[PDB]
Amino acid sequence: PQITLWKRPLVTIRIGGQLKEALLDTGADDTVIEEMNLPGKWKPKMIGGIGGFIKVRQYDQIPVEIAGHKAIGTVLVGPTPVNIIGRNLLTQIGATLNF
Amino acid sequence: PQITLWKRPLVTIRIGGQLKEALLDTGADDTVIEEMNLPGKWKPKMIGGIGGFIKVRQYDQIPVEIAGHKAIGTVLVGPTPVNIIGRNLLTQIGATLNF
Numbered sequence: 001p002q003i004t005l006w007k008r009p010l011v012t013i014r015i016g017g018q019l020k021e022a023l024l025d026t027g028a029d030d031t032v033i034e035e036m037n038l039p040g041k042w043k044p045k046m047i048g049g050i051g052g053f054i055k056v057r058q059y060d061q062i063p064v065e066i067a068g069h070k071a072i073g074t075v076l077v078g079p080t081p082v083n084i085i086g087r088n089l090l091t092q093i094g095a096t097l098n099f
Numbered sequence: 100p101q102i103t104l105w106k107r108p109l110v111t112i113r114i115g116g117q118l119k120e121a122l123l124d125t126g127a128d129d130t131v132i133e134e135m136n137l138p139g140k141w142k143p144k145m146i147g148g149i150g151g152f153i154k155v156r157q158y159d160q161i162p163v164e165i166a167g168h169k170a171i172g173t174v175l176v177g178p179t180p181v182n183i184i185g186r187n188l189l190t191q192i193g194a195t196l197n198f
């Protein structure tokens with residue numbers, strides 16, 4: 001689909017059998033989801049943003065369905081203000097910026 | 100043009116007569132520019148992101164050329180690690196996300 005930017009680009013995703021709302025963020029290298037229970041092992045990691053660094057749990061090879069499109073990749077879980085779909089998964093669904 | 104997301108979507112912008120590289124960021128509500136001595140009146144503001152909040156100076160109606168496309172709107176100036184073009188200016192150049 002073609003999404004305009006007058007409103008935040010929020011979309012429903014399905015992760016771990018659960019539905020959630022997430023922001024398609026071209027300015028994010030990675031995908032960071034609010035604290036939740038995800039199956040499998042996770043490694044501790046730190047990611048940075050505008051205000052500094054936060055500690056997150058890194059899950060590898062997790063299936064994520066974004067607006068009906070499938071992706072499988074790394075998902076970081078931690079204290080983020082909003083669920084974020086970053087470039088690692090946006091590239092898998094073939095998302096591009098157009099103007 | 101069509102910009103893929105394999106790499107950070109950085110482009111050249113023109114602001115205050117200067118050329119800078121900035122990130123096309125669909126996850127940023129407003130545009131945030133690295134510290135620069137822009138003339139004009141401003142209002143203090145706090146914006147929060149992953150690691151927390153930072154204090155910025157809000158300037159209104161600042162002309163910004165993005166990849167040869169003219170836009171004009173609010174620009175926040177503060178200690179950001181990178182120049183960020185947000186939805187407030189992206190909507191002006193007709194930018195969309197497509198997949």
Ligand SMILES: CC(C)CCN(C[C@@H](O)[C@@H]1Cc2ccc(cc2)OCCCCCC(=O)N[C@@H](C(C)C)C(=O)N1)S(=O)(=O)c1ccc(N)cc1
Pocket residue numbers: 023025026027028029030031032047048049050051080081082084086122124126127128129130131146147148149180181183185
């Ligand atoms: C939705 C919310 C959690 C985040 C909104 N933000 C935009 C988001 O795209 C920001 C933009 C940004 C900030 C710093 C940076 C690189 C990009 O370099 C440092 C080095 C860190 C780069 C790694 C990275 O991509 N970090 C992402 C994170 C969400 C995975 C990130 O914070 N992306 S923001 O904090 O930069 C921001 C907030 C408010 C306004 N108005 C503008 C920008």
